[PDB]
Amino acid sequence: LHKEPATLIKAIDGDTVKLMYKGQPMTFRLLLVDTPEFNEKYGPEASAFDKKMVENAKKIEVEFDKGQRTDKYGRGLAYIYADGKMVEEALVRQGLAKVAYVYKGNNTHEQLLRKAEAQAKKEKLNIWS
Numbered sequence: 238l239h240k241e242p243a244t245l246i247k248a249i250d251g252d253t254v255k256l257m258y259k260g261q262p263m264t265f266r267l268l269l270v271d272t273p274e275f276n277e278k279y280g281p282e283a284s285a286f287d288k289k290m291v292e293n294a295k296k297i298e299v300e301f302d303k304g305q306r307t308d309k310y311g312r313g314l315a316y317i318y319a320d321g322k323m324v325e326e327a328l329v330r331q332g333l334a335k336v337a338y339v340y341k342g343n344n345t346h347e348q349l350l351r352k353a354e355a356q357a358k359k360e361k362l363n364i365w366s
């Protein structure tokens with residue numbers, strides 16, 4: 238797997254972000270996680286967390302897994318990194334996202350993310366409180 242350049246266009250919610258990728262505006266849906274919608278408990282906190290990581294990042298990168306790269310709504314499916322920190326891992330570790338939507342050719346970071354989620358659970362943090 239490799240990391241590719243991208244730039245922030247704008248933060249959307251806890252697991253969606255608008256980026257410029259190969260010079261094209263594009264909605265990215267984070268692989269392997271689910272954040273609450275904004276209108277649900279921990280949604281605003283998840284939005285705020287993601288926003289902070291991406292807006293304060295000097296460098297954003299996009300990393301596709303080996304399976305499909307666009308979903309049925311035309312969103313990009315990637316892991317997102319902000320100055321080398323994976324956004325999915327930070328959210329899950331904070332208990333603002335669940336490991337979710339784990340499909341077959343697109344699950345390289347599943348174990349890593351489940352570890353993060355185990356700690357958040359043991360802390361009874363946010364979603365797990």
Ligand SMILES: Cc1cn([C@H]2C[C@H](OP(=O)(O)O)[C@@H](COP(=O)(O)O)O2)c(=O)[nH]c1=O
Pocket residue numbers: 266267268269270271308309314338343
């Ligand atoms: C994260 C992810 C979501 N999706 C689709 C499945 C879900 O479809 P349905 O909308 O039909 O339930 C939807 C959930 O995204 P959101 O959690 O952003 O709504 O996005 C994928 O197809 N692949 C993925 O890797």
Ligand SMILES: [Ca+2]
Pocket residue numbers: 252271272273274
């Ligand atoms: Ca969601």
